[PDB]
Specification:
The structure is a homodimer.
Chain A lengths: L5 E5 L2 H7 L5 E6 L32 H18 E11 L4 H10 L3 E10 L15 E8 L26 E4 L23 H11 L5 E4 L6 H8 L3 E6 L2 H12 L16 H6 L8 E3 L6 E4 L5 E3 L2 E3 L1 H7 L8 H4 L1 E3 L4 E3 L1 H10 L1
Parallel strand pairs in A: 1-8, 2-3, 2-7, 4-6, 7-8
Antiparallel strand pairs in A: 3-5, 4-5, 9-10, 9-13, 10-11, 11-12, 13-14
Bound molecules: sinefungin (2 copies).
Chain A binds a DNA duplex through loops.
GO biological process, one term (chain A): DNA replication
Organism (chain A): Caulobacter vibrioides (strain ATCC 19089 / CIP 103742 / CB 15)
Subunit structure (chain A): Homodimer.
DNA sequence: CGATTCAATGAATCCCAAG
DNA sequence: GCTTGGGATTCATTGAATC
């Protein structure tokens, strides 16, 4: 009953949370199974198989079975949460809307939805959808009548900080050395979250010494980040082999003192989308002997051939490479000007 | 249907008046709160989505956009009513409004949901190659960076104030329409507002049907859409998918004369050789079949594209047989 | 050694036209 | 509607293998 700074519990999160005292934790971070509902095998363009999340703990018979599970552990989570505490839940489109409805139905007050913008997600291989390049976190206090939840706005110096105050966080996947390897040399856990995501949650909505509960502990990512930042934690996980890796990982964590951005692309298609050029407009060269027509997707046409400003600009000169930004010009009131001016105009607004 | 249709009234009553399976795409920006209780909003949400699904064609899709206040309500009703989510989209606002209150994170995004009408109707419009071109030749992702609707695009009312509190940017609808419709498709917007969907639809050569209950918003929408310069249809072409090129069976390459029975095909390294058959099959020793089944068998692969795998001898060296398919398509 | 080329992989609801 | 099989499809990053 008298826990230490690190507590790892083997069992089902509903049963184990119900055994904890009520109003006992300052923050809850939940990474529940998403119930991806995958049909079958997916192959990369080189015919190699994707190691998909097909584990038994992500299989649910239906939406209704997932909703009953969701409302059950959320109710147990709300019981052990302190009155001035908060909960974080993460998901993708497969589940985050069902989690969010259950969060609101149980009396939580959603303060923000936070987007985890993945810099290096697995792409869409067949060309059937947009690349699923993000996940969604929900940050909610225990009630809208709650006294005062924790939000370290003045401590983190977030006043007018254009990157900290944003509700979208650009963070890479958990790969490389941080990705814990199992006994077979492969990944130990299929859905391990990057520690950098947990750092932003912990440092913004907890104080040193606070108790963080993770009812889906996995390989102990919440615990490793809490211990490194001077927070106490309680982890619950059903799988014993994940807990073996979590215990060995956390024992190697050295607590630090917590007080201790790539260039974005500007596609030509964005300039046409913004209306700075219209589809059907004409692009000229420096002299005006070569012309191209703008298409709605940022491609351009010369004769019967179409393509990007760089491929077509290279074809119109019979040259290997070409920088279409400096080669193509658009008519203004003062004559021809390179489309690179419009690229700098959109770039300055980003 | 008509290129431009604007209807004054309630979206549930009006959508029920339309014929079934008549619209290709639905874009919905519902109000956050119901009347200017979650139970009331959930019933309203379930009613207009159910009415929208009936009007949608079997191969159509729906877009909804909201904030954290209501998007979970809408997302659950979308899934529950039989829609199948393809993506949720994050509109990252390039220039978000600053939040100096210091109590929450600054609202720098909104969420969109793109879903086909049902799960097993997997034929839906998605112009993958056009959007890849639009994203500098890397495939378009679920995170979109688009500025807020500001400047002269923000429709002003009398006395100079903003006319609509939740007017969406045209560039956002431009990417929606560019990606999930074709020229000629009809787009239904049951929450028209000041006509953002219509202005973008008219620009890209799409029909639209707008429904809005406030007459003051419809006067602004009509005047705004009238000033939209429509792009000529010959300028609405985008990059196409190779899945829609005229199929040239390999049996036609042999019957034409570009390859003869007895010719040998090679892999990239030249270690896998196959002989051409009269009917278009190829043989590797005792194995015989199509250029795709044999190409996969000779390298122990589940699948293979024989057009890029097999090569025929030319004056410059090994050239893929896809070169010969291009010659047939050139004529 | 450094520079250049391969190989691997990540929460994924991932084909579609012809008969 | 179903089945069949042609043939289309990948981004960022890490770390080893090769030159
Ligand atoms: N009912 C349950 N009680 C406890 N743990 C569960 C239960 N159901 C699923 N789990 C586990 O929850 C974990 C879900 C993971 N997404 C968590 C990974 C964790 N965030 C990490 O970074 O390592 C899986 O390891 C499941 O085994
Ligand atoms: N029941 C209803 N039927 C039709 N329109 C409604 C209804 N309820 C609210 N509306 C309107 O729907 C609009 C919701 C807006 N968010 C849409 C704005 C629109 N996307 C724009 O860019 O202008 C508001 O103008 C509402 O007045």
């Amino acid at each position: 009953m008298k826990f230490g700074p690190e507590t790892i519990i083997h069992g089902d999160c509903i049963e184990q949370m119900n055994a904890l005292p009520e109003k006992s934790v300052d923050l809850i971070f939940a990474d529940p199974p998403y119930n991806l509902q995958l049909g079958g095998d997916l192959l990369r363009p080189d015919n190699s198989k994707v190691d998909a999340v097909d584990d038994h703990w992500d299989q649910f018979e239906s939406f209704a079975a997932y909703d009953k599970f969701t409302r059950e552990w959320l109710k147990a989570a709300r019981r052990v949460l302190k009155d001035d505490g908060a909960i974080w839940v993460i998901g993708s489109y497969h589940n985050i809307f069902r989690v969010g409805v259950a969060v609101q139905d149980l009396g939580f007050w959603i303060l923000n939805d936070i987007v985890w913008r993945k810099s290096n997600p697995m792409p869409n291989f067949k060309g059937t959808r947009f690349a699923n390049a993000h996940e969604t976190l929900i940050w909610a206090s225990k009630s809208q009548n709650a006294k005062r939840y924790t939000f370290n706005y003045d401590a983190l110096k977030m006043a007018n900080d254009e990157v900290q105050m944003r509700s979208d966080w650009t963070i890479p996947l958990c790969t490389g050395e941080e990705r814990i390897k199992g006994a077979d040399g492969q990944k130990a856990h299929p859905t391990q979250k990057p520690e950098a995501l947990l750092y932003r949650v912990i440092l913004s909505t907890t104080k040193p010494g606070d108790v963080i509960l993770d009812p889906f502990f996995g390989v102990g990512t919440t615990g490793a980040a809490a211990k490194r930042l001077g927070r106490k934690f309680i982890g619950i996980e059903r799988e014993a082999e994940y807990l073996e890796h979590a215990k060995a990982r956390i024992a190697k964590v050295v607590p630090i003192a917590p007080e201790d951005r790539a260039e974005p692309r500007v596609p030509f298609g964005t300039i046409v989308e913004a209306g700075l050029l219209s589809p059907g407009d004409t692009l000229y060269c420096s002299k005006g002997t070569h012309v191209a027509k703008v298409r709605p997707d940022g491609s351009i046409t010369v004769g019967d051939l179409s393509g990007s400003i760089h491929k077509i600009g290279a074809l119109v000169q019979s040259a290997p490479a070409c920088n279409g930004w400096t080669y193509w010009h658009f008519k203004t009131d003062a004559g021809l000007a390179p489309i690179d001016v419009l690229r700098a105009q959109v770039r300055a607004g980003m």
